[PDB]
């Protein structure tokens, strides 16, 4: 009585055929996973960097950005393992690329899944690994094969459904610290996801029973909270203090809460973080940066896509490309100096 | 690479044909919903009660308990509208009736769903309405037609997935406050559940499709305490009422879990404090949740064979006679409130 109806949904298998992943895309995704694993587990001393737009609403602009990040990745491969941020939505307002690909308030999930997949293929096909946030348990079925890094939404860190999901993904997954500032829920999540799980889920577009093997590559993401920002050494210490033995490295988000809701502070956070890294801090193995071709953000005008400024986020504000180069080169320097403190 | 494999899953439709609901079952489910609605909206001045085991692992024992509650219910029907707790499982490393129906640390979801549906039919068949937690977006499809009340656990009240599910359910849904004791996430969930959603889900035939729901105006908050302490006292209740927007439904207080502090004998103490408020005129308290079984306490696991009869194998519960005394007191508080209101 509360279900208006069901509209047809193309299965992942069908989508994978219409928008096939090139050998390069597959190899790229595989490579991104290996590198991320070695870093969060300490086998590698470079830093894992998830850099990119808060969200992608324009494939062309994303491709130009990707090409720039690719070039700069090759320049800093020795110190950084860069994965492009390819998030589809920011949890009223534009519901994201999957739900509203045309950015016109309509709903076209089938067209959305096609755009999202075309995007993922486009990016990985040039040798650039991507990372996306797992919003639900069904969409990953359509994109996972092209992902090298996944993050679980903060609102679902405590969800068994997402912990089960994580336990079955073929790549590292990050969980955010609780809203109260503590790391319990995230730690529990990582432990839960490490176990094998048995559950019902979509596969061919039908529901089946899944058995996962468990994911040992889950880590905590520091993202500020009710007790303030937590990227500083004091907070980092408190964070490591509550990480049971055998934990993976921590990943720090420069944006959102830790940036005090101001894209301009991301580089300031970079400074405080680079400082720790340069002085020998080995628990910080990753960072998250919201960057785009141009800085800041913009609202969606009455006209729609037609009135949007090119290369400017329509969700959270980002630092521009030039600033991103500065931030990343500085981070790379911090990593280099860190190898020395470890000599 | 982290998916050990899949096993075929009988569809909700198949199981509904296999284990059909009797005309008495459907009628009870319907009635349970109508009565719950009139209460949470303030039409009826009786109190809604969701009483029953933490979980059901023994169908026979559940039936005995049901007969008793059905009889006690007929006695108090003038003051209370009773719905029996018929839950299957919070994940804390027994996996529940759906996963481990044999209570022997194995997995058989197909058999679990059958036992669950049979259980639901058995109970509603004697005229006793039932309530359960809505775990995911799939399992409910196998039981919805028999349910009169649904609950969203504290660990998933923030899950968009569950808010979407609630908006499409044919009965009232209660959202529990967060594990940290935070109430706004539940108030929030009710708002979200109140309107239409468009997302990916599964049909009666087990096919993934795009679902459009209409919104559920019968959602409410369930105070169940948490990390920052219990929340059933007058101060907390007034604090809770303050957060609720205009036109909100009444509150439901959970005597167990966070509000009893892992001590079943605290449930009757909560009942006294809650009764005092009701007896003295508190009209905003429209519901209560109680963890009750034939015999009090709980127990661990020779397998089922060794387990004591009417005793839970999950959260401790108050025994039957305690339950009866608790309910009769609650009933009196109700009658008293009527008198206070006529003034
Ligand atoms: Mn963002
Ligand atoms: Mn319980």
From Swiss-Prot, chain B:
Gene Ontology process terms (BP): amino acid biosynthetic process; aromatic amino acid family biosynthetic process; chorismate biosynthetic process
Cytoplasm among keywords: no
Activity modulation comment: Inhibited by tyrosine.
Induction profile: By amino acid starvation.
Remaining remarks: Present with 26300 molecules/cell in log phase SD medium.
Native source organism of the sequence: Saccharomyces cerevisiae (strain ATCC 204508 / S288c)
Entry keyword set: Acetylation, Amino-acid biosynthesis, Aromatic amino acid biosynthesis, Stress response, Transferase
Protein purpose: Stereospecific condensation of phosphoenolpyruvate (PEP) and D-erythrose-4-phosphate (E4P) giving rise to 3-deoxy-D-arabino-heptulosonate-7-phosphate (DAHP).
A molecular function (GO) term: 3-deoxy-7-phosphoheptulonate synthase activity
Gene3D superfamilies for the chain: Aldolase class I (3.20.20.70)
Pathway assignment: Metabolic intermediate biosynthesis; chorismate biosynthesis; chorismate from D-erythrose 4-phosphate and phosphoenolpyruvate: step 1/7
Record-stated family: Belongs to the class-I DAHP synthase family.
Keyword DNA-binding among UniProt keywords: no
GO CC aspect terms: cytoplasm; nucleus
PANTHER family: PHOSPHO-2-DEHYDRO-3-DEOXYHEPTONATE ALDOLASE DAHP SYNTHETASE, PHOSPHO-2-DEHYDRO-3-DEOXYHEPTONATE ALDOLASE, TYROSINE-INHIBITED
Main enzyme class: transferase
Upper classification of the organism: Eukaryota, Fungi, Dikarya, Ascomycota, Saccharomycotina
Domain of life: Eukaryota
Reaction(s) this enzyme catalyzes, per UniProt: D-erythrose 4-phosphate + phosphoenolpyruvate + H2O = 7-phospho-2-dehydro-3-deoxy-D-arabino-heptonate + phosphate
E.C. number(s) listed in UniProt: 2.5.1.54
Official protein name in the record: Phospho-2-dehydro-3-deoxyheptonate aldolase, tyrosine-inhibited
InterPro entries associated with the record: Aldolase_TIM, DAHP1/KDSA, DAHP_synth_1
Pfam families (alphabetical): DAHP_synth_1 (PF00793)
């Amino acid at each position: 009585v509360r279900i208006l109806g069901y509209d047809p949904l193309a299965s992942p298998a069908l989508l994978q055929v219409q928008i096939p992943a090139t050998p390069t895309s597959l190899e790229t995704a595989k490579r991104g996973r290996r590198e991320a694993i070695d870093i969060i587990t300490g086998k590698d001393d470079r830093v894992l960097v998830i850099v990119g737009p808060c969200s992608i609403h324009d494939l062309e602009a994303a491709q130009e950005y990707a090409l720039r990040l690719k070039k700069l990745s090759d320049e800093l491969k020795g110190d950084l393992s860069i994965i492009m941020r390819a998030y589809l939505e920011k949890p009223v307002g534009w519901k994201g690329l999957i739900n509203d690909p045309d950015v016109n308030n309509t709903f076209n999930i089938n067209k959305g899944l096609q755009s999202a997949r075309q995007l993922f293929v486009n990016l990985t096909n040039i040798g650039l690994p991507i990372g996306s946030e797992m919003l639900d348990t069904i969409s990953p079925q359509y994109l996972a094969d092209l992902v090298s890094f996944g993050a679980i939404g903060a609102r679902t860190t405590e969800s068994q459904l997402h912990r089960e999901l994580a336990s079955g993904l073929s790549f590292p997954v990050g969980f955010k610290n609780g809203t109260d500032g503590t790391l319990n829920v995230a730690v529990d999540a990582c432990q839960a996801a490490a176990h094998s799980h048995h559950f019902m889920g979509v596969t061919h577009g039908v529901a089946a029973i899944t058995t996962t093997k468990g994911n040992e590559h889950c880590f905590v993401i520091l993202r500020g909270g009710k007790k303030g920002t937590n990227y500083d050494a004091k907070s980092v210490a408190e964070a490591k203090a509550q990480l049971p033995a055998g934990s993976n490295g921590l990943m720090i988000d420069y944006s959102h809460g830790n940036s005090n809701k101001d894209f301009r502070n991301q580089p300031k956070v970079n400074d405080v973080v680079c400082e720790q890294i340069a002085n020998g801090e080995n628990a910080i193995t990753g960072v998250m940066i919201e960057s785009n071709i141009n800085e800041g953000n913009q609202g969606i005008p009455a006209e729609g896509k037609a009135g949007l400024k090119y290369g400017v986020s329509i969700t959270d504000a980002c630092i521009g490309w030039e600033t991103t180069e500065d931030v990343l080169r500085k981070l790379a320097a911090a990593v280099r100096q860190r190898r020395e403190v470890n000599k």
